[PDB]
């Protein structure tokens, strides 16, 4: 059973889902336009409820954390990272582990680096710490939700309605473009060496959105990290291979 609610954090009413009675608190961080409802069903259902207390949050402007509407300032990943940690603190957790997917993995990396005393362990997949020319072709190619996959679009179109979905996606691409102009096309290359907790980087070898060199780079610069490659995994490996992923995550977190 899962409970949904909102809590006031940094001027916004953030929505989140929570389940479990475990003493090990875990936050599930969704990707672009994601939410606990669309990105973490299998985890909120199957992660061990005796071992963990699981929380899946909706970044401001995403999921049900509306208003406000989503905007992408130069520091939007850092703003989400602060909101995520403040949300867990508002929920009274003294320390937490992070499971971050894609943009959520980027967010998790930043949170671990900026609030090291609050993060126990971290599991991230599909994240990229910077943008290259190869990446540009990829994100520019997804700007138009019209060309998106029918199966991948349906859930977001249902949650937000076509208009908000389409527009926010365009604004997301515009936000990423700004990183390309910065030195090293940096998003969080500089924070990787500051992650002090045990980290597990998972990557689907058939991931069509994030080239593997991005996972290799994060693995290289996050001290003590482990890199797990899934031969058949794509970008949504925690959903397509949920039992395998959940087992992997549960083993690492304990
Ligand atoms: N779903 C998300 O959170 C995006 N980070 C996925 C993505 C990665 C790289 C890209 O070039 C484009 C899209
Ligand atoms: Mg450089
Ligand atoms: Mn929600």
Curated annotation (Swiss-Prot):
It is found in: Mitochondrion. The modification N6-succinyllysine is found at residues 89, 147, 154, 223, 234. Belongs to the AB hydrolase superfamily. Lipase family. The keyword Cytoplasm does not apply. It catalyses: L-homocysteine thiolactone + H2O = L-homocysteine + H(+); valacyclovir + H2O = acyclovir + L-valine + H(+). Residues 25-144 form the AB hydrolase-1 domain. One of its GO terms (molecular function) is alpha-amino-acid esterase activity. GO terms for biological process: amino acid metabolic process; homocysteine metabolic process; response to toxic substance; xenobiotic metabolic process. GO terms for cellular component: mitochondrial outer membrane; mitochondrion. Monomer. May also form homodimers. Expressed at high levels in liver and kidney and lower levels in heart, intestine and skeletal muscle. Keywords: Acetylation, Hydrolase, Magnesium, Metal-binding, Mitochondrion, Signal. Its EC number is 3.1.-.-. The active site is at 102 (nucleophile), 207 (charge relay system), 235 (charge relay system). The record marks 103 as: Binding of alpha-amino group of substrate. This is Serine hydrolase BPHL. Changing residue 235 to A: Complete loss of valacyclovir hydrolase activity. Mg(2+) binds at residue 184. The modification N6-acetyllysine is found at residues 49, 82, 89, 154, 180, 206, 223, 234. Specific alpha-amino acid ester serine hydrolase that prefers small, hydrophobic, and aromatic side chains and does not have a stringent requirement for the leaving group other than preferring a primary alcohol. Has homocysteine-thiolactonase activity (in vitro) and may play a significant role in the detoxification of homocysteine thiolactone in vivo. Catalyzes the hydrolytic activation of amino acid ester prodrugs of nucleoside analogs such as valacyclovir and valganciclovir, converting them into their active forms (acyclovir and ganciclovir). Changing residue 102 to A: <0.1% of wild type valacyclovir hydrolase activity. Its main location: mitochondrion. The keyword Transferase does not apply.
